[PDB]
Design a protein around this ligand. Structure first.
Ligand code: HEM
Ligand code: HEM
Ligand code: HEM
Ligand code: HEM
Lengths: 306, 307, 306, 306, 306, 305
C-alpha cells in the first residue's frame, strides 16, 4: 500500500510555488535532495505543531525524469503541450522541478524553500517563484470564490491518484501549472451581472447559476467535462492569488492535480480552442497565461528510495 | 476490528504523567476503575469540546498484570530491564499503573487525574507525578526541537500497534517511561556547535546534520536503528518538558510507544552500553534517568470488558 | 460504497432546525431542491474554510416519501408514533422535510437556510424553526452537560447507519426530532442533589452516579437499554439549547439519529410509559414536548440521483 | 465620572431587550438598576478574557419621571413619530432598554435571564431581538454596515454628554428602530442600482465618488454638517437578525449620540427629505416597526441608587 | 507621574509565584538583577507578541528593604503580622523577594523565572515556588468563580497604587501572599447549598446571595469592608489554583494588591480573629494557610535607577 | 491633535509602498491624501474584530514644497547620504510612503490596490515590499528584532512631535532603508560569533553583559545617550521580506522618531563609527539599497485638504 504526497491536502492561507530547471551535471545534487525533501519538510514543520499545516509536493518534468532515473516512466508524462488558439494561446515554458509548498503561515513556507534552494545552489536555475496569499473568503483576483467544486474524500482520491492503470507509479499524480495575469481594468469595466455570466456563478453568494441562465461560453460550462462513461471528469485545484500593486500585477497561480494529464488537457483545449457552442472561455478575455508546465508528482516512498 | 487507546494521538501543550503501585488487597478497586476509565475521560472531556483534546492512555506493568488478571499475558510484557553501563545507568523503578493524560489545557488533565485518584484512594501508592508543558516551538529543556522524526499515518500504525503477531492483544502497545533530569550548567557550557554534535541536528532550524558530519556517538546516530529487514525501526515519542526553577530541576519526561519493547530496548541498549563505534550516547553526559518502567497499554475494549 | 450524509459529524456551537410540510403541487419543486442541496452546502460552506464546519442533513417524512418517490421505501419509515402515557404525552406534529443545519457560526447556517427556503418558496409551509446555540461547557438549559455518552468512531457508525438489514437504503439513517420546553421555575425549586437524582449524573463535574445511588427513574437509567443479545442500544444526539427570555421560554431541541426507529422508540416508550420499577422519566416532570416528527435521512448519493 | 460601555465596539452576538414598567413596578426596577453592573460581572467574569460581555441600560422619558425625583437629562423626551408623505417612523412603547453584547450568545442569554428573573411581575416585554454577525460585518442588505463609526477621541466627543449638562456627564442617548427588509424587492435590483441606494460599492465597501453619489442615497442623507462646518456623528451598533421561515430579514438599528438632536435631524432627512431628495431610498426596502428613545446614564448613577 | 509595574494587569491562564530569601552577602547580586528585571521581561516576552501577555511584578520584603537600600522607606512596609485566632491561624513565613510572573502560556513564565534565578544563583535561597493554572471558567479548587468583584479601571487604580499620601513611592503597591491548602474531602461532604452559604455566592452562576440570606460568617460578608466615607475598601486579587493529585494537594495561591497593607490586614483580622457577628470566616474551616509574606512592589522606574 | 497609527505594534503582515509624484500629479495626490483614512476604514471594517489594518502616510521634503504652502516641519529634509570608509548609506528617490500593516496580507494588498488605483498615472512606483513575520518575531539573521522598542508614555514622548514644533504636533519622522543580507557569509559564522555581531544571545534574546559586549556590536552602537543624560529612542517596525530564487533575504528598516536627528545620530555611528569602533559589524552582512526620509503628519492634517 503506497503513500502519496500531500496532493489531496486542502487549500491553505499561504503558499510558495518554485519552478526550477536542472543545470549541467546537477543530477546528483538533485537526486539526494529528493531523498531528503520529506526529511526537510518535517524539520521545519514540526516547529509549528499543530496549526502549521506545512506540506511540500515535489514534481518532476518529462525531460528531467530521463536525466534522473533509469527504468520505467509514468505512462502519461510528457512536456506541456502549447495550445495556439485563434485568439488566446496557452504557452509552454521550461521547468524541470516543481516545489508546491503550503502552510497556514508564510514563514514556514519560506523557511522550507530556503532549505530546499540552499541544497540546490549551483545545481539549478530558478524559472518562477510565486508567493500566494488567501484573499478574503477564498476569493481570487476576479472577486469570485475559487475552489468550491473541488472533489472531496473518495471522489478526490479516485480523480487525483494514479492506480492500477499504471501500477508501478501508483500513488502518484500529474500537476499542471500556469501563471495567469489578469486585466483588472477591463474586468472592473463589466457589471457584476456580466461578470457572473463569464464565470457561471453568483459573485457574492457563490451559488451556481441555473442551467436556464448559464451561458455555454461561461467558465463553469467549459470546464464541466463528461467522459464516454458519463461520469464527471474532475481535477483538484489549489489556485492561489498573487500580485504586486506597483507593477499592476494581479494574478491567479493555477495548479491542477489529476491521475492523468488527459483530463486537465481536455479542459485546457475546451477553454483555449473552444467547442461547437463556444469560440473560447470568456475568462481568457481577462486572463493571460505567461507560464505552462507539466510535472509528475510521485508517491512519497519513491522519492525516499534514492 | 479492535479499538486502540489514543496511543497514536499527537503531542499536546499540557500533559500529566501518573505512575502508581497497587497495594495488597487493592486489586478489586483497580479493576473496578479500569472499566470506568474511558467513561471518566468522556465525563471531563466532553465539557471542553472541540478544542479540549483530552485523552488518557492507561498502561499496566508486568508484575501488576499477574496480580490483576488470570489468563494470557501479552507476549512482550516483562519488567523494565535495568542497564548497568560502564559510565551511565538506566535504573528500574516501581510502577504498576501508568496514566498518560494529555489535553490542550492543564485543567482538563488535572480534573481527570483527580477523578481517577479519587477512585483509587486507599488502593494505590503514588510513585511519580509530572506536569508537562510545551516549551516554545516544540523544544525540550536542552533547547532542541523534540519529536521531529516521529512516524505518522500508516507508518505510525505499523510501528506502534500490536497486530497479528499477538492476536488476543491486537490494538495494544508497549510504553517505556523514563524521567530524565538535565545538567543545564554543563550543557550551557558547550557551544551551540558542540551541542549540535551531541544531538545530531542543527539547533535553531532542526535540520539533520550531514551523514559525514554526524558523530557516531550522537543521539540521532545511536537511536537510528535498522533491523534484519533493512527497514527502519521506529517508536512514537510524546516527550514533555517539566521542572522547578528553585530546585534547579530541568527535565525531559520520556515516553516511547512501540508494538514490541524489543525496539525501544535495542535503542536503550545502544545509548547506555554503546556500539562498536560509540562508547555511549553523548546526551547521557547531561541527562540522568531517575525512573524506568515498562507498561502494556491494552486495546480500549479490553479495559471496558473487565466490568 | 454508498456515501452517507453528515449524520456522524459532531456538535457545533450554532445550529438551525427547519421543519416544513410540502404544499399540494410542491413535489416537483421539492425534488429539484433535494438534488441541489449538497451543491448549495458547498457553495455557502466553502467561503468559511476551514473553521466553518458547515453541514446540512436533509430528512424526509413517511407521508412525504410516498408523495415524492415510487418503488421501495426504507423498512422502518413510518409517521411518528404518539405516546399517550398516564401522566406525560409525546405528541406527533406535522413535518415533511427536516433540514438539520450546523456550523461554528450562525451566519453560515442562516445563509444556507435562506438559499434553501428561497428555492422552496410557494411549495412548502414552515412548521418549526429553531436557532440553537451552545450554552457554556456543552450544557443544556437544565444546566447539565448534554451529549457525553454519545457513541464515537466505529460504534457510532454501527448504531447510526443503515446496513445489510435494509440493503437498498444502506448509508441512510433515522432522525427523531422533538422540541422540548422546560419549566425552569419548578426545576429551580429542586436542590442540586435532587436535580442530580433526576438526571443520574453530577451537575458540575458530569461524572455518572454509581449504580447504587442512581435511581431507577433517573434519565440515564431509563435511556440505558441493552438488546436481547446483551449489546447496548445507542443513538447519536445533537441536542441544542434555544430560548426567548421575554417569553420565559427555555428549551432543548432534541434530535436523535439511529439505524432503526425501534431503538429510539424503545427509549421514548421507557420514558413516557415507564418500566416495572419506574412510572416515568423524572426529566419529563420538567420538560414538555411540543413537537414530534420522524424522518429518513437518505445516503447522499440517493439525493443527487434525483 | 465613569460611563457605561457605550463606546465599546461591535461584537458577534447581541440581545436587545425593550420592556415597559407595569404600575407598582417602580421599586423592583430601581433595585435591579442598582445591581445590573454586578450581575454583568457575575456572568461576565466566567468568560474572561475573550467573553467581552457588556450591558448598556437605557431609561425612557415617561419612565424617568416615574422612577426619579431629582433633575432630568436636558435632551430626554419620547421618540418623535415622523409622518412623511410615503414612509412613517413609528413611536412604540419602551421604558427600559437592555443592550447586551458579547462574543458569544450564551453570555448574552445568561445575563438577560438574570435581569428578567428579577424584573418578572414588574415589567412587560415589548421587544426581544437576538442579533448575529453576518460575514464581513454585513447587514441583511449585503452591505458592510458601521464603516464610518467615529473612533477614539472623536467617538468620545460625539457620544458622551459633557459640560453642556454637567449633572449627567458620561451619559448618552440611544435611539432604537427595528427594521424589516423586503429582500425580494431588493434582490430584484442590480448590484449597481443597490450601490446607488446605499452610496458605497457593495463588495469593496468603498464610498462612491461625490460626482456619482445620488442625492437620495443613504450616505448622502445621513451626512449632516453642523452650523459650524464639521460633521455630526453617531455611534451605530446595528445587528442583523431574522427568521427564514417567516421571511423576516432585519436590521436592528441602535445609535448613540450626546444629544438626540443629531440622530433626529438625520432621521428627519431620511423620512421627510431635503429640497433635492424626497426621502431615503433605503426606506423603499426597509420598514421601521419600532421606535424608542432612551437616556443611558453614567455607570455610577445606576449604582448610587442605594 | 511614575510608571507602575503591571500590578493592574488582568488574570492570566498561567502563573509562576517565586519567593526567595537573600543570602548573607548577596545584596550586590540582587541589586544588579533588580535593575535588569524589566529587560529580562522584554527579552523573553517579545518572542510571544502579542498573545503572550508576559509580565513580572517584583516585591521586596520589610527586612530585605533595609539590607538593600539606604534612605527613605515606604510608609506601610513591615513584616507580615501573624494572626493567632481562637481556632485558625495565619502564619508568617520568611520571604525577601517576590516574583509574580504571569502569561497566557506557562513556557514564557518558566523561561523568565529561569533567567531571573540564573542571575540570582548563589545569592538567594528559594522558600516557595508555585505553578498556577486557570481552572475552567475562572474557578478555584472549591469550584467557585474566583475574582469576580475585583475593581477595574480608575477604581482599581485608586485602590492599588500608592498616591500622594507617600509621594516618594507613588506608583508602588503592597502585595500580601498566602499559600492555602484545601480539605477537599470535607468540602465535598457539604451540599452545594451549604457551600454557597460558606462563600456567599451561587456556585454555578456566580450570582451573589441577597443580603438577607447571606450569612454573617460567609467569606463575602467578612471580606466586605466599608471605609470612613461609607465606600467599599477594595483589593486586587490574582488568585491562581495549583496542586499535586498524588500528594492530595489542592491549593489556592492568594495574592492581593492594595495601596496600603491596612486594607488587606483588616480583611485578614476579620477572617481569622472574627467579629462580634462572626466567630471566623467559614472558608478557613476548609483552608489552611501555610505561608504568609508581605512585599512592597515599587514603581518600575524605581527598579531601573539601581 | 489626533496622530496617525504610528504608536501601533508589529503585525504579521505589512506592505511598504514608496512612490514619486510625477510632474503635474500634485492635485491627484492631494485628493488621495484627504481620503486615505476613509479608504483605510472601507477595507479595515470588513475584518473589524482582529484585522488590525493601519496605514501610515509619509511625505518627503521635496514633495512637501510641491504640495503645500506655508509652514514646513522643522526637521524635514532629504535623506542625508553617508559615505563611510567601507559602507555606504545611499539616498534614493521617494515622495510618498505608505506603511500598511494588518494581521493578514489580503487586507494590506486590498488597501494598497485602492490607494494605487487612485494614484494611477500621477505617481511612479519606486519600491514595493511584502513583509511577513518570521517565527518568534525574528529577522532574517535569526535574531529577535524589536525587543528594546519603547512602549506606553516612553513611546509617545520619543515618537510624537510636541511643543518644539506646535504647528505639526502629533506628527513623526520616518526613516526607511531596504537592507539585503549576505546569508552565505552570515551562516558561516558560529552562533557565538553572530551574538558578538548583534550584542544579544541568539535563541534567548537576552542582552550580553556590558563586560562581554563588543564596542562594535549593533546594540552597542545604536545605544545613544543624549547630551541631557537619558537614552535616545526610536520605534522600529522592521519586517523580513525576500525571494528564495533571487537569493534575496532582506530586512525592511523603518524607524519613527520625534526628530530625525535621533535616527541620523544612530546611522552616523553605524556607517562612520566612533573612536573605538570602525563601523557597525552588522553592515558586513547587510547592504542598504534604499534610503528615504518622510514626515508623517497628524491624521487631522491629512483630512483638512
Ligand atoms: C535524555 C532525554 C532525551 C532527549 C532530551 C531526547 C531528545 C531528542 C532529540 C532532540 C531528538 C532529535 C529530534 C527528533 O527527531 O525528535 C531525538 C531523536 C530521537 N530520540 Fe531522543 N531524547 C531523549 C531520550 C531518548 C530515549 C530514551 C529514546 C529511546 C530509547 C529516544 C529515542 C529517540 C529516537 C528514536 C529519535 C529519532 C532519531 C531519528 O530517527 O532521527 N530518545 N531525541
Ligand atoms: C427533555 C429533553 C432532554 C434533555 C434535557 C436530556 C438531557 C440529557 C442529559 C443531561 C444526559 C446525560 C449526559 C449525556 O448526554 O450523556 C442525557 C443522556 C441521554 N439521553 Fe437525554 N435528554 C433529553 C431527552 C432525551 C430523549 C427524548 C431521549 C431518547 C429518545 C434521550 C436519550 C438519552 C440517552 C440515550 C442518553 C445517554 C444515556 C446513557 O447511556 O448514559 N434524551 N440526556
Ligand atoms: C434601514 C436600516 C439601515 C441600514 C441597513 C443602514 C445601513 C447603512 C450602511 C450600509 C451604511 C454605509 C456604511 C457605514 O458607514 O456604516 C450606513 C451609513 C450610515 N447610516 Fe445607516 N442604515 C440604516 C438606518 C439608519 C438610520 C435609521 C440612521 C440614523 C437615523 C442611519 C445613520 C447612518 C449614518 C450616520 C451613516 C454614516 C454616514 C457617513 O458616511 O458619514 N442609518 N448605513
Ligand atoms: C482560602 C483562599 C481563598 C479562596 C478560595 C477565596 C475565594 C473567594 C471567592 C470564591 C470569592 C467570591 C468571588 C469573587 O469576588 O472573587 C471571594 C471574594 C473575595 N475574597 Fe476571597 N478567597 C480566599 C482568600 C481570601 C483572602 C485571604 C482575602 C483577604 C485577605 C480574600 C478577600 C476577598 C475579597 C475582598 C473578596 C470580594 C468580596 C466582595 O466584596 O464581594 N480572599 N474569594
Amino acid at each position: 500500500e503506497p503513500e502519496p504526497q500531500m496532493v489531496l491536502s486542502p487549500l491553505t492561507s499561504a503558499a510558495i510555488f518554485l519552478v526550477v530547471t536542472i543545470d549541467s551535471g546537477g543530477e546528483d545534487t538533485v537526486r539526494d535532495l529528493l531523498s531528503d525533501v520529506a526529511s526537510l519538510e518535517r524539520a521545519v514543520g514540526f516547529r509549528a505543531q499543530p496549526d502549521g499545516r506545512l506540506s511540500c509536493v515535489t514534481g518532476i518534468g518529462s525531460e528531467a525524469w530521463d536525466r534522473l532515473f533509469s527504468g520505467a516512466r509514468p505512462a502519461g508524462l510528457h512536456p506541456f503541450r502549447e495550445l495556439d488558439g485563434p485568439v488566446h494561446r496557452a504557452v509552454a515554458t521550461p521547468g524541470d522541478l516543481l516545489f508546491h509548498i503550503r502552510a497556514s503561515r508564510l514563514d514556514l513556507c519560506f523557511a522550507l524553500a530556503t532549505e530546499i534552494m540552499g541544497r540546490l545552489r549551483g545545481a539549478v536555475t530558478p524559472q518562477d517563484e510565486v508567493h500566494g496569499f488567501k484573499y478574503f473568503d477564498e476569493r481570487d483576483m476576479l472577486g469570485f470564490v475559487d475552489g468550491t467544486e473541488n472533489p472531496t474524500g473518495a471522489a478526490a482520491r479516485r480523480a487525483v491518484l494514479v492506480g492500477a492503470e499504471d501500477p508501478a507509479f501508483a500513488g502518484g499524480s500529474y500537476a499542471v501549472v500556469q501563471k495567469y495575469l489578469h486585466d483588472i481594468d477591463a474586468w472592473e469595466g463589466l457589471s457584476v451581472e456580466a461578470q457572473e455570466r463569464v464565470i457561471g456563478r453568483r459573485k457574492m453568494t457563490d451559488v451556481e447559476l441555473s442551467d436556464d441562465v448559464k451561458p455555454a461560453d461561461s467558465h463553469v460550462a467549459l470546464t464541466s467535462v463528461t467522459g464516454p462513461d458519463g461520469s464527471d471528469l474532475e481535477i483538484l485545484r489549489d489556485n492561489m492569488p498573487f500580485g504586486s500593486v506597483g507593477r499592476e500585477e494581479f494574478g491567479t497561480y493555477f495548479i491542477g492535480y489529476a491521475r492523468t494529464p488527459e483530463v486537465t488537457e481536455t479542459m485546457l483545449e475546451r477553454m483555449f480552442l473552444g467547442t461547437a457552442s463556444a469560440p473560447h472561455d470568456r475568462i481568457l478575455d481577462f486572463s493571460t497565461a505567461v507560464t505552462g508546465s507539466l510535472f509528475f508528482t510521485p508517491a512519497a516512498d519513491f522519492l525516499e528510495d534514492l
